[PDB]
Every structure is written in structure tokens, then in C-alpha cells.
Amino acid sequence: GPALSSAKLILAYTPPGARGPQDRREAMLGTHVVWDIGLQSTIVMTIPWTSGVQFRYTD
Amino acid sequence: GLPTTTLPGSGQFLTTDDRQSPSALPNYEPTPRIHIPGKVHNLLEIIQVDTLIPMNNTHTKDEVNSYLIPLNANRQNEQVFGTNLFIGDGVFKTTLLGEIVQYYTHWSGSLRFSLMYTGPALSSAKLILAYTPPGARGPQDRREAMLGTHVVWDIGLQSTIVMTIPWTSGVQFRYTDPDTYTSAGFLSCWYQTSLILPPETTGQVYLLSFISACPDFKLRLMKDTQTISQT
Amino acid sequence: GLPTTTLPGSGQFLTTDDRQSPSALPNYEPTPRIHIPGKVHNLLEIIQVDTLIPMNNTHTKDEVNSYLIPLNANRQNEQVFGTNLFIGDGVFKTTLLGEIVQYYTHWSGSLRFSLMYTGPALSSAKLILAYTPPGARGPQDRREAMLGTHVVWDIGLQSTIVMTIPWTSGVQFRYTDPDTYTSAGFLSCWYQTSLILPPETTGQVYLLSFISACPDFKLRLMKDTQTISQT
Amino acid sequence: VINYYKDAASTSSAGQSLSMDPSKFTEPVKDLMLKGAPALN
Amino acid sequence: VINYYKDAASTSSAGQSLSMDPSKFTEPVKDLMLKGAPALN
Amino acid sequence: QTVASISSGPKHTQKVPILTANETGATMPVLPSDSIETRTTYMHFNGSETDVECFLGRAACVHVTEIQNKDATGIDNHREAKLFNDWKINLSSLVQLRKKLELFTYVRFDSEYTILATASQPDSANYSSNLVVQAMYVPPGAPNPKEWDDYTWQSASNPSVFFKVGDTSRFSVPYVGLASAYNCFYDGYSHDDAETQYGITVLNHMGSMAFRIVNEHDEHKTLVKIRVYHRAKHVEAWIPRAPRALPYTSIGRTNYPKNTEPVIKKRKGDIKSY
Amino acid sequence: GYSDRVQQITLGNSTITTQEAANAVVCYAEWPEYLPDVDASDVNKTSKPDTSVCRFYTLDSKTWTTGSKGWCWKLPDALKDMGVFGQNMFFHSLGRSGYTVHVQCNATKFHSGCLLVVVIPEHQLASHEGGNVSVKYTFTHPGERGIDLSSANEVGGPVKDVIYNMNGTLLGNLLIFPHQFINLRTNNTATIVIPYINSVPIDSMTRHNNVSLMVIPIAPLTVPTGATPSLPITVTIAPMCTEFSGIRSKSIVPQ
Ligand SMILES: COc1cc(CC(=O)c2ccc(C#N)cc2)c([N+](=O)[O-])cc1OC
């Protein structure tokens, strides 16, 4: 978006066990990143390996 | 003559001051001390000795029964007794601990609450004592009680169970006079399994409860007690 | 008995004396100290923290607007605000500095007066703050003001300008209570160039002013304040 | 703490005993009982 | 300055603290800000 | 000793000490030497009089009450007849000292009390009686006096002072708070209840001070007014707050009157007026 | 290469970033810490959930309009229904905690407005009824919705004149408390780290709110010509060095 515009978004990773968040509050309760749009154009949120069994199926 | 300036307060009689004063009997020689057992130096020494709690203070007048906590055979998960922990009032008010505690305004430390089983040797039982720290209500069923500090007591050869009521508080001192901010919580007892009597036995079974202080204990600001008068 | 002579004053109660007195609670053991952040040792510590000045105290009642100093676009060399420097009265009377200052009779030292611009980022402006030491009247036009202690402030990335009001006096202490002999002078602000707003912008622009003391500061002779009574 | 008077009774309060041994009241048993060991062995 | 009384509360006023550190109020910022350097760098 | 201002001359640099950003929340220690040419001067000042120990270290009246010596015959309520009286200890009844204490959030200190008793005989009297006052401290939990002659005045454990009217009583009391410091404010309740009281009135249950006149009655009636003064010593204060601006309405709560005059003075003229 | 402007804060599995901050404030220059033995009183061994409670929780965004008076939240109240932190609050008799408060509000270089963001320890509110009326439990425990200073009074509630800080002191002197400003032309966010401040080692987390957080518009909001006359304000709070003690049954509170 244009340089003179602004915004603050929040990315969120919801580990298995519960449903996909239906509202920001629900999402924010798990792994997340509050991104402030600015000079640095890109936000990098990592999705940390969160699992019991140490390998998942690609299928 | 040394110049002096008398300060405000001069002439006052403060019942609490500790100064010297002339002896009205000069040269009097008091009687020699002899050895006498049982010397007491601090009241904190004696409140560590436990005395019986009149837990069952449900009678019309004072009586030995006020100290007997009834226990019923084949009852399950039911409540045996309950009480708040205002040690300066209620069941505690007449006990040695309560009596001494009332001579002071503040208290802190841990309490030692114990129960001694008196039912027949060939009988059995498993009870659960529970301390509910301030913040929530007195437990209404075993489950609620068990969620906090507790002890599962197995009646057996060793007749007495000693559950300590660990000092659990934010502010480091409570008032002896019942005060809400400084409430200590609740004490309750329930059936873990039930009381079982042997054949040819039908008599009532009782529990004796005691209260005393741990070395943990502290009392401050001496004051008069509500336990005596004339108007 | 040691011969003594009581001096005049004996028996008096001087609210300011500092003597010893017997404790009414002997052997009482106060609660242990624990760490608590934000300890204050001297009032001179806290008056160095600045608070907002209700410079625009031109309203019918107290309100947030009393703290907003209006700035107008495309005005040139005109006056923005003015005030005398009786820190114990006027606009200063309700500020932390003024409030504390009023607990004392004398003051000395340098004041820290600052302005923070709140207008849109894409707007610009150059103002001039000026301190007029005692002896002459409060400046009536920029030229008059500029002839004394002043600061030309360029609004920019750094939002706040801090103009110090250097201790300028003959006698080394002034009265907190407004007194002519000990007057501190005047403070004024003018347009150096003008306030310029960007396109699509019409909203009002405001300035926030703060007041605090420099380490320079001194206060003497504690007294009661006119800022409280009953009812 | 200068005693202005000749007799002992004249002096002020004694100050904390600092003895504090409750055992002569809490544990006046003949055979020592160790906490943790069977009260009745 | 001889204390006639046994308890601490009896003694007179403490005397000047002589600590005087206003920074915990005037400069409670996480990143140190040097006078003269850009407040916002 | 300490320098009040160092000698500073002309300036032309990229180091601009007078340009800051107050939104950081800091008050940069800018000095006159940072914006004008200064000469050297010394402090010749330590700021001893603004030390909290000094600020709260002087006696302030914290309560005025009244008791009287008269025939008690027939009187049913001694307390009401003022044959003896009470004072629910608190330091926020009289506003002067209160505003000072409330300059801080937490406060710890020992207290030195000075009690003054003055006699008065409004009606016809042949002489001024020589009355002795007894001030007894009744800690919460101690039995309260009901009659000016209860067994309670034996004061076997409660500390109490006896002094002549017209004279003054003095003694100090150690820091009696239950916590590590006293609270000047308390954003809380005694327990989680829908109707219970809010504020420090919940924490301030310090007990009462019972006053009475030991003498039996004389033919006339004597009115004794009692004034209690408080001086703090060995002071400690934490978390300074905004000074009280509006008038008080009640002991312990921050409440202020409805429809109060504005506190900030209104300019007689412009925002440009001197 | 670094700047007060750009910052990252990571607690638990939550991370907030800002590219337009104005440093950060650490109340009374003290970072939060756990309760040391020397200061402890309660003999119970405490519980330190660590990462499961010491993370950022985001409250519902408020809407800043040209007529807003301000908002007031209270801690720990504001987080009583926030994940495991909330649960621990009610299941324990006692507890202590510090926080990292992050208030967000972005606009454009054409807007203008200045919010005061302050933390007030022991913010004892006043009753609008005056005299000696109290303020009912419910009204000082608004939860995450907080108190709206531009809403009307209500029986049993507190007074809400922004000007008198809801306690009889003037707004202008609120700056003596650890604070920060969000001045749209400079700021985008405000960050304040709060250490445990109390006269007791640990306390009840339900009957006592240790501090209240206030976001107060000082310089009113102004938007460019023909733009939406409002901006959202978002508050994100993360507990730190949280300790819980005296676990029992779950507490039941007024309403
Ligand atoms: C002289 O009258 C007495 C007064 C007091 C009350 C006291 O000292 C106090 C001071 C400040 C604060 C605060 N904040 C709370 C209480 C006590 N007392 O508390 O025990 C005894 C008195 O006579 C033994």
C-alpha cells in the first residue's frame, strides 16, 4: 500500500487441538505477531514446529 | 543550678512507661529463690501446647459434649464439621490459643490443628481435613474442599492426625478481632471413604480436636481481652 | 537531687520541636520492610519531573482545553501566549511545581519550561519563546521580547523544545507568595515565521506546555498551603 | 542506663528473657519421641 | 544524642537522607537518552 | 562545595540539548548552561528542609473532640451525654496533614502524639475545676467503654495516659501497620462482595482512643475539649502522585463535592495577558 | 543502525513490533522480578506458569472520536478472562505480577492528536455522588471492556470527569506517574513496563487492583478533510514474573 498509509495487523498460528480462530481474541491467545507497517516492508512470522509426534504426513 | 526546659508530657502517667522509681522499703532483703519446675518466659512458649476445641458448640449450655465431634457409620463423602478461622472468636475463643491470642491485636504464623479418633479399635475410617485459604467460600462438598490444602487421614494404630494450617496470606499480619480484610479462611472435614464399625458395635463414635501454634507464630500490640469483666 | 533551674518556655508545645518521648507500645515489633519501587527522599526530587501547565485557563470551568495552547495558521509575528512568572499563582498554581512550591515560603533556582508540538507531521512552524527578566514590562511585540533571553524553536522530528528560565535575580531568594520586589519576570511566545498546514488539513493545531525545576532549585521555610481547606 | 537509686527494686524492666524453650510443656514425655517416627512403637 | 528510652520509636527525627536521586522519576526510560543526542534517533 | 551553574560560553554544534521528545515520558535534565552563556555559581544549599523526614516531621492537629464533667445520675447513654468520648483513629479527618500525606501512595513512619485538653465553663461556676483526663487506647478487639466508669478503664493491658486538663500529654507509637507500609490509597475491597465498602476505609481499622474525666462531678458543668496532634518521625515514602485539587467530602475516600468551584484560576484577560 | 523508533518485544509465544515508538518506560526504573525469600511471608511454595501466562493479550479496540474523553482499565482485572492467566487468578488465594503495556494507535502524517498513556498505582476512584458514597465492586472491575470516561454516571459507579482523574486531582499532574504520550505526528505506540508495586509481598488478585491504565486524549483528534472522523486505539498487555500462591477451589465474584 502507499507509503503515506499506515496499518497494524496481527498474524496468528493456532497449534492443532482447537479450531481455526473465529475472531481476533481467539487467535491472539496462541502464537502470534503484531505487525506494524512501516519503512521495513516485510514481517516474518515463523510457524514453530509444534507437535507431539516428531513427523507429519505431507498428504 | 543546671538550666533545664520541661517538655510537653511532663507530669503525665503513661501506664506503659518503664522508668526507675524510689523504693519504699530501703534495705529490705527479699526471700531467696528456690527451684520451681515449669518456669514460663514467653506466652509464645505455652500457645504451642494444644488444648481441646469445643467444635461441637451446638448445645444449649456449656458441656463436655461441646468437645465431642460426632462421626457416623456408613455415611459417604458427607461433611463432618466446618468452621471459619477467626481464632479470636467462634469455637476458638475459649481455647488456650484463643484466650492468649485475644491479649494481642495482631497475629501471624501457622496453626496446628489435630484430630484424635476415639472409636473402637476394631473399627476403621478414612477422613479428609481441608484448609481453604481466603478468597473463596467455605467448601460445600468434598470435591470443592479437596482442591485446596488438605490431608487424607487413615484411622489406625497412630490415633492422632496433625494437619497444619500453613500461614497463607498477602499482608504479613492479621487482626485477632474478626476482620474481613484479614480473614484466615475455612477449615472443614469430610468422609474420604466411610466409618465402619465391627460386629456387636453400635455406640456413637467421636473425634477430639485440638488447636495450638507452630514455632512459626507471632503476636503483637498487647491489649485488653473481651473474655473477662465485672460490674 | 541535682539542683536545676527551669527556663522560660518550659511546658510549651512547639509543633516544630524534635525531642524524644516514651513509647506507648513497648517491645512492639513492627512489620518487616519489603522492597517497594519509587521511593522518594526529597520533594526537590519530584519537582524536577514536569507536568502540564493549564496555560489556556481562559475557560468558564476547568477542562482539558485549559491545557491546549491554540496555534493559528498563516499568522505572522503575532503573540501566541503570555504569563508572568509568579510560580505560586496564576497558571502555575495547580501544577506539581506550583503545588509543592506553595508548601514553602522562599524559592530560588532555574525553571524548566518546555513546549511540545502536536500539529500534523506534514505541517511546519518556527516559534520564539522569550523570558523577560524583571525590571521592564511583559513584551508587547516580538521585537521587544527577542531583546532578552529567548529560544527560536524549529518544529520538527524532535517534538519538544526546552527553554530554561535561568535564575536571574539580585536578591538570592524570592517569595512563593506573589510579591513585587521579588517578581520573576515574564514568559511569552511568538511566531518566528508562521504555522503552515499541508493540503487537505484544516484542523486546529495545539501546543502542550510543561513546567519543572532544574537541579539548580531551592525551597525554604515550610508553611501551610492555600490550596486546601475545610469548614 | 544509670541507676539513680540504691535498691534493685528501683531499677526499670528487665528486658527480654531470650530463653524460649517450650518443650518442658509440649514434650514432657519420659521416652524421647522423634518427629516422623511412630508415636507408639 | 543519648537515647533515654528503650524503643526505637522513642528516638527523635532521622536527619537528612542525603540520597537525592530524581532519575527514577525524571528518566524512567528503557534505553538511555544522552542530553544533546537525538531524543528519537 | 556543589556548583549551581558551571561556566558555559558560545555554542554552535550538532549536539542540541534543548530539543527533546516529551512523549518518551522523560524529563531530560536540561540546564541554563545548555541554552545561555553562564558564569560559575555555587549551591550553598543541601535541601535539608524538603526531605520527607522534615516535610511530615512536624506536629499537625488530626482531631478535635469533646467530653464533659457533670452529674451522671439518670443519664442512660454515657457516650451520647459525652461523659466520655471516642475517636476512631484516622489521619484523614482534618485536611491539612491529609493533603501532605496524600502526596505519596505508600508511607511508613513512627508517630509522636501530643494531646492538648482545654477546659471551659460556659454556665455559672464558682471556680475552675482541676480535672484529670484519661486517654485510653482501645485496639480492635478490646472491650469498648459503655459508661465513663466501666471496668474497662482499669486499662490493665490497653495503654492509657493520665494528665491534667490545661496540660499536655505526649508519647510516641511505633509503626503499627500490618503491611510493610501504610496505604494512602487502596483500589480494593475487604473481600469479593457486591455491596461491601471500597477504599482505604477497609484497611484503616486502627481502633479507638477513649477519653474521659476521672473526677466525679462538681456542682457546675465543665466542658473539656481535646485536641490530638500528630508528628511523623523516621519517615519513608513511595510512589508520589498528583496533589489533591478538589475539596474532600469524607474520611478515607477520594470523593469530591458535586458542583464545585473551578480549581484553576481563569485569566482576567487573554491567554496573552501578563 | 538501531533506534528508539523500532522495537520488538517477545513474551511467551507472542511478539509485538513497532516502527514508530518513542523509547519505552520502565516504571520507577525497575524491571519486574519474582518475590525473594527475604521479603516473603506466605509459606506456600508458589507456582510460576511462566510462558503460559506471561504473554501478550489484546483487548477490544476502542474508537477514538472527536469527542472521546478517555478510557480506564485496571490490572489485574482487565485480564481476568484471559486464558490461563485468568484461570490462575481465581483458583489461587494470592498472586503477584508485573506487566508490559503496549498501546497502539496509527494515523497518517495529515492527522493530529495526542493521547496520554499513564499507569497509576492504587488508583482509588471517587463516587460521583460525593459525600461518603462508596463505589460498588462491579464498577471497578469492568474487565477488558474497561471504563469509558465519556459514558454517563450510574448508581454505585465512579465519577468520570477526565479533568479530575476520577479522584479529585487535576489531569495535568498525571505526568508524575510513569507515563508516555502517543502524539500522532511522532508516535504510533506507547510502551510501559510495570513492576509489582504494593505494600505487601503478594496479594489477592480479585479484591484489589494494583494499578489502572488510562489512555486520555489531550490534544483532540483531527482528521484530514473528508476523512473518517475516528481512529481505533488498541491495548495489548502481557503479565511478567507472575507468581500464584494458595491454590484452592475456584473463586466466585460479584456478578
Ligand atoms: C496516640 O494515639 C494512638 C494512635 C494510634 C494509631 C497510630 O499510631 C497510626 C498512625 C498512622 C496511621 C496511618 N496511616 C495509622 C495508625 C495507635 N496505634 O495504632 O496503636 C495507638 C495510640 O495510642 C497508643
Closest CA to E20 of F133, C28, C215: C215
3-class secondary-structure state, position G236? strand
**Residue F227, CA distances (Å) to C9, F109, F169, G145 in order:** 20, 21, 10, 48
Whether the bond between G76 and the residue before it is cis, its omega within 30 degrees of 0, is yes
Q: What is the CATH number of the domain that holds C226?
A: 2.60.120.20
Cell 537525592 belongs to E20
| DSSP β-bridge partners for residue B191 | B127
Cell of B201: 458395635
Domain coordinates in residue numbering, chain E: 1-41
Please provide residue B109's backbone torsions phi and psi, each rounded to the nearest 5 degrees. Answer: 120, -175
Residue C145 gets the label, from left (phi > 0), alpha (psi -120 to 50) or beta, of: alpha
Does residue D39 contact residue B160 with C-beta atoms inside 8 Å? yes
Cell 527494686 belongs to D9
The method recorded for this entry reads: X-ray
Give yes or no for F10 touching C (CB within 8 A): no
Does residue G124 contact residue G130 with C-beta atoms inside 8 Å? no
Q: Distance (Å) from the C-alpha of residue E6 to the closest C-alpha of chain C?
A: 8
Closest CA to C123 of C73, C174, C59: C73
Please provide residue G37's backbone torsions phi and psi, each rounded to the nearest 5 degrees. Answer: -50, -45
Going by DSSP bridges, is the β-strand pair C205-213/F84-85 parallel, antiparallel, or unpaired?
unpaired
d(CA F152, CA A7): 72
Cell 515560603 belongs to C105
User: Residue F126, Cβ neighbours under 10 Å: how many?
Assistant: 9
- Please give the radius of gyration of chain A, using alpha carbons only, rounded to the nearest integer: 15
Closest CA to F176 of B168, C40, E9: E9
Does residue C197 contact residue C73 with C-beta atoms inside 8 Å? yes
d(CA F26, CA F17): 14
d(CA C2, CA B216): 49
Closest CA to C106 of C167, C42, C168, C175: C175
Cell of F64: 478535635
Please provide residue F78's backbone torsions phi and psi, each rounded to the nearest 5 degrees. Answer: -60, -40
Give yes or no for G52 touching A (CB within 8 A): no
Residue ranges of E 8-37 with Cβ closer than 8 A to chain C: 9-13, 17, 19-22, 24-26
d(CA C94, CA C97): 8
Cell of G219: 490534544
Domain hosting residue C75, numbered range: 1-231
Q: Do C202 and G114 touch (CB under 8 A)?
A: no
End-to-end CA distance of chain A: 36
Domain count, chain B: 1
Determine which of C96, C218, C227 to mutate to test the interface with F (most F C-beta atoms within 10 Å): C218
d(CA G74, CA G214): 9
Q: Indicate which residue's Cα is closest to atom 3 of ligand 1.
A: F137
Give yes or no for G162 touching C (CB within 8 A): yes
Identify the H or E element spanning E40: none
d(CA B111, CA B59): 26
CA dihedral G82, G85, G86, G88 (to 10 degrees): 160
d(CA C94, CA C102): 10
d(CA C43, CA F100): 11
Where are the alpha helices (H) located in chain F, listed in sequence order?
A: 52-55, 78-81, 95-101
The domain defined by E1-41 carries CATH number 4.10.80.10: yes
Please provide residue C162's backbone torsions phi and psi, each rounded to the nearest 5 degrees. Answer: -120, 105
Q: How many angstroms is it from F157 CA to the middle of ligand 1?
A: 16
Closest CA to E18 of F100, C222, F53: F53
How far is CA B137 from its chain centroid? Answer: 21
Cell of C108: 530560588
Using CB atoms within 10 Å of the CB of residue B76, give its burial: 0 to 12 exposed, 13 to 18 middle, 19+ buried: exposed
Does residue F155 contact residue F232 with C-beta atoms inside 8 Å? no
d(CA G188, CA F265): 34
3-state helix, strand, coil in chain C (%, to 5): 10, 30, 55
Identify the H or E element spanning C76: none
3-class secondary-structure state, position C94? helix
Give the DSSP per-residue string, B159-223. Answer: -EEEEEE----SSS-EESS--STT---EEEEEESS-BBPPTT--S-EEEEEEEEE-TT-EEEEE-
d(CA D36, CA G187): 65
Closest CA to F229 of F119, F88, F117: F117
Using CB atoms within 10 Å of the CB of residue B126, give its burial: 0 to 12 exposed, 13 to 18 middle, 19+ buried: middle
User: Residue F143, Cβ neighbours under 10 Å: how many?
Assistant: 17
Give the DSSP per-residue string, G48-83. Answer: --GGGTSS-EEPPPEEEETT---EEEEETGGGTTSH
Going A22 to A28 to A29 to A30, the CA torsion angle's sign is positive
* F235 Cβ closer than 6 Å to some ligand 1 atom: no
Cell 479450531 belongs to A19
Going by DSSP bridges, is the β-strand pair G230-247/G62-65 parallel, antiparallel, or unpaired?
antiparallel
DSSP letter assigned to residue D2 = -
d(CA B225, CA B99): 8
Closest CA to G42 of G95, G99, G88: G95
CB-based contacts of F7, cutoff 8 Å, min separation 6: F38, F39, F40
Please provide residue C144's backbone torsions phi and psi, each rounded to the nearest 5 degrees. Answer: -60, -45
Using CB atoms within 10 Å of the CB of residue A57, give its burial: 0 to 12 exposed, 13 to 18 middle, 19+ buried: exposed
CB-based contacts of C204, cutoff 8 Å, min separation 6: C70, G220, G222
Closest CA to C50 of F238, F34, G179: G179
Domain count, chain G: 1
Name the residue among C36, C63, C157 with its Cβ closest to that of G199. C36
Domain hosting residue F109, numbered range: 1-274
Cell 513492576 belongs to G195
Q: What is the CATH number of the domain that holds G19?
A: 2.60.120.20
Identify the H or E element spanning B84: strand B79-84
**Residue C30, CA distances (Å) to B184, B219, C25, F8, G245 in order:** 21, 11, 11, 51, 25
Name the residue among E7, E12, E39 with its Cβ closest to that of C19. E12
CB-based contacts of G157, cutoff 8 Å, min separation 6: G127, G128, G135, G136, G139
User: Residue C152, Cβ neighbours under 10 Å: how many?
Assistant: 13
d(CA B79, CA B128): 10
Name the residue among B12, B17, B222 with its Cβ closest to that of F157. B222
